[PDB]
From a paper:
The protein artemin acts as both an RNA and protein chaperone and constitutes over 10% of all protein in Artemia cysts during diapause. Artemin monomers are 229 amino-acid residues long with a molecular mass of 26 kDa and form 24mers with a mass of ∼624 kDa. Unlike ferritins whose job is to sequester iron, artemin is unable to bind iron due to naturally modified regions of the ferroxidase center, iron nucleation center and 3-fold channel. Importantly, several biochemical studies point to the chaperone activity of artemin being regulated by a redox switch courtesy of the thiols as well as its C-terminus which diverges considerably from ferritins.
We provide a structure of full-length artemin at 2.04 Å using single particle cryo-EM coupled with cell-free expression. Therefore, octahedral symmetry was imposed in subsequent steps of 3D reconstruction and refinement and led to a final map at 2.04 Å at 0.143 FSC. In total, all residues for artemin except the first 21 N-terminal residues were modeled. Although prior molecular dynamics simulation studies suggested that the C-terminus of artemin forms α-helices that extend inwards into the cavity of the molecule to fill the space, our cryo-EM map of Flag-artemin and the corresponding fitted atomic model clearly show that the C-terminal residues do ultimately turn inwards, but they first hug the inner surface of the core artemin shell before extending only partly into the artemin cavity. Artemin’s loop L′ contains Pro198 and Pro201 which potentially prevents this region from forming into a helical conformation and helps favor the interaction with the inner surface of the shell. A third proline in the C-terminus (Pro213) provides a kink that results in the C-terminal helix F (aa 216–229) turning into the cavity of artemin. In our experimentally derived model, the artemin dimer is oriented similarly to an apoferritin dimer and a disulfide bridge exists between Cys61 and Cys22 of neighboring opposite facing monomers. The overall octahedral symmetry of artemin shows an extra stabilizing interaction relative to apoferritin where the L′ loops or two monomers form a hashtag arrangement that connects the 4-helix bundles from each monomer in addition to the ferritin-like L loop interaction between two monomers at the outer surface. Somewhat surprisingly, loop L′ and helix F extend and contact neighboring dimers which differs from all prior reported homology modeling efforts. This results in helix F from each monomer forming a second 4-helix bundle toward the center of the complex.
Residue numbers in the entry:
A (entry chain I), B (entry chain E), C (entry chain J), D (entry chain Y), E (entry chain V), F (entry chain A): 22 to 230
Write the structure that this text describes.
């Protein structure tokens, strides 16, 4: 690419660093999702919450990369580290871990805003609108859940009831759809391949209406 | 977890290795997507294709992890390496790279099937049905695209027309929906937070019908 | 205003006093609402109940002022004192506080009825129909809730389950709509201001039908 | 509450002060509403406008309190002073009073923004988006009304015609709905109380559909 | 352009001159629109009328340029002068100014018709049908408004009532729609840019029906 | 106007200067539109794009003037200069010209934001939200088009295919509606004029429904 100008290089470097931070957070949500789906754990609410969190983090990383590309910069990708701890004694530890991660993300975003505030107004507005609001809302939600868990306790069937309630409230908002793909079903109908005749299909449809 | 039995440990280790391979492929698709979206490249068809491929690979990794968890095993996650090359001279190089990756994936899957064939019939059936068909179909599609590109050439406006056609045929099958999240809009309406009243909303809806 | 006759001045003074009492009750509900919405409390049911109570008290004060104005009197407003206690150890204390406030309101209303009974029949009918019924019903509801809470206990997850149930039953009856306002969105469309062309809009609508 | 951290204490104090300012403005609108509804005044347009203004101010105070609670702070409520003047010679004086109040509110908000600008980006964005826009729009509308009134005059039937027009344009935007409550109607049907069987009702409804 | 023949050069020059006259009239309507929208004027009817007039004049200039291009000529653009007076004592002066401008436009059009009448029949028909009718109708409307204003007077609330009526009658005929544009909302969905995938969208739509 | 206070005079002057800049850009788009519509050029896509750009620039100028009027200032209009060059060798030159103009606009807006940042928070928010986003998006789109054109070439039928595609994608978003006007058709039906009976028509319509 013979064009990487306009955008300030230091801001570009900091943006790429934050992109990698978001990718690491998305990866770490996967480990929690896998941990709580074991046949000896079977906690449906935590599973749904962790899946939703991982998808949200991936979308945030994609959005920041798209913003960097819109201003005319380049994005360089590097190594993604493995999560350190892959087990939790109870729900309180997991919620505390998530709260600490949110605080770290907010600190990084504030540093970015401070860096880009003097020159680029649009960049600072993007930082303070499209990236911070989600973090603030998620932090409030997680803090409320943590307070409720601390009040309820950690023995008996209290955690089970809490998990059922959490699954109910999470499923009312998020539901991941399936990703379509290709297969060898009906081989005799798609001889070269399935996609190559798409245009033709469109013509057929117009003749039906 | 005091339960990790039944599933053969060697098969579990090989399955985890293949999961990491799929995750690496998904990560590498992101670099191509970012490369072809630069303001000095602006190739819409390649962008759509790479986005679709990354989502497909992520779904495949999730499916294999779910199968391991269903049989009673554990999944341990480790480091994801960075892609080596992040630039391509023309479309032919990118398509060749993808074809080679597909061949590597197929070889790994065949080794897995050979390992698990003697004892576990269900595992071998899962390998040969739910994992190989997608790879075979994608390999055929990519080979057809590569042959067409080689016939067309690499100079003039041929690649531009090919890219427009590719975008048209890809968009007829895949369209990634947005992931819902939380925000601070309408603060006075969701005082503790937005999710905590979900159950109440349901009751209201029943009274309306 | 050169007209303040007909209505008995002593009745007018007592009515104004009761209006200020209702306003004070409405203000005190706000403190409870703010207390139970803290991130370290997060009790959704109590929040909904307190919000509903504050709105009900405000409506009652408005109704009494409207009745005074209908009979030809004047309303003079004075200072609203701050609530004394702004913290509660458990739900039982809050419910007891509300019950005591209801008893005080009922005593004041009975005194008003006694004052106005001899001369004005319409005023006494208004007092005994439009002001007392709400208080009686609310007192019964709060007493039932208090008895249930005392039976349940104050330790473990009993209060959490009670709070969830309370939110469910309150939300089935009350939902505060948003108050519309003015903004600077679409500045080029409402040049003087948004309201000044309302009449014109009406004409347009008639031409569409 | 063992948690009041994160939020800067000086910003919290200033926010609470502004909350009390908004509450005072909401209270003062009530006096104007009561003044213009007397049987010797009977100005419908001014009544509607003052009612709308009081509701808007109350909503603004609620929104600021909710924002403070979301960031993890506490809200402490204090005394609300009585309005000073409770009579106006003509509409021009009332409109001038409202304009001056709007200017005072804007100055306070600007001071808040200056205080919180250096450290918290999200707080400053909230101040400049969710609080200032309404004030600017309302100030423009009130200034336009004041200019029209000054041009029209103050004698004859000019003010009366203006009052009809104002009522017409205000009523096209705002309409306060009734607040539901409890009563003793149909006593034999709701024996413990009306709310306690809400869940049961829902089941019945599902069986009807 | 190696083709500028057929069309008579003198007619082309006169047409370009009239195009610039229409553009100047459109520009001058903007100043009146801005003058009557000040917070110390706030005349909604005059604002609507001036906005409509400016749009009409711009459309007329576009139509004349299109006619010149259809016959095979060229259009050369030059400087647009500023309006001389930017204030008016009352509505009568503004209406008189508009009437005088209409008379000037009609004189110019008559000169054009005289110039092109001998040779080109189609050009003269275009002048007498597509350009004069609007001017005649607008002149009649403005003269009627001026007579009504002169009869009404210039003191009291007469002009204000007239302004409401004018706004009502203008708004029943004209309403300028918003012009769509591009933005950075939903950045993650339109990665290269929003327009480049339009064709693909069409295919998707056909598959839905 | 005896009222021009509140708004800072230096900010007002800078705003008026930027308004004139936007008007000049809108005027210059007209010359390109006229150039590409000649019978010896006949490029439909460029014609549509230039028409859309001119309308967008006019709307932006109107929006900035409306914002100045809302804050209580005055707008003074001056002379609009003629465009310098009115011919282009190929599409690349036109796209480069547009990109340079966008860069100039962005620099001016950044200077405005710097000027108004210290005192007025609402003004700076308006600058960074309602004026910069459009420029950023349009710059990205034009850069993508320029890169595609440079890759395609400048000889043969490549530009023709590109122009057809550009027309297709532009027309999917923008379509300028006709501006209604007055005429002398059906003279016997609208005797004084067409508008004067509008109110009566409304009554008739109500009687039909």
């Amino acid at each position: 690419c013979p064009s990487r100008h306009n955008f300030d290089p230091e801001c570009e470097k900091a943006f790429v660093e934050h992109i990698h931070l978001e990718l690491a957070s998305s990866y770490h949500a996967w480990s929690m999702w896998a941990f709580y789906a074991r046949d000896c754990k079977a906690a449906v609410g935590m599973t749904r919450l962790c899946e939703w969190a991982s998808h949200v983090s991936a979308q945030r990383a994609r959005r920041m990369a798209a913003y960097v590309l819109t201003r005319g910069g380049h994005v360089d990708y590097k190594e993604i580290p493995a999560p350190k701890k892959q087990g939790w004694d109870n729900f309180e530890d997991a919620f505390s871990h998530c709260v600490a991660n949110k605080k770290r993300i907010l600190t990084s975003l504030q540093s970015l805003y401070q860096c880009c505030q003097s020159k680029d107004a649009h960049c600072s507005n993007f930082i303070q609108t499209d990236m911070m609001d989600e973090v603030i809302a998620w932090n409030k939600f997680l803090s409320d859940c943590l307070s409720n868990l601390h009040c309820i306790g950690s023995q008996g069937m209290g955690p089970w009831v809490f998990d059922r309630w959490l699954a109910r409230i999470v499923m009312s908002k998020f539901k991941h759809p399936k990703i379509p793909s290709l297969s060898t079903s009906d081989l005799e109908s798609n001889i070269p391949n399935e996609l190559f005749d798409a245009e033709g299909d469109m013509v057929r449809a117009i003749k039906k209406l």
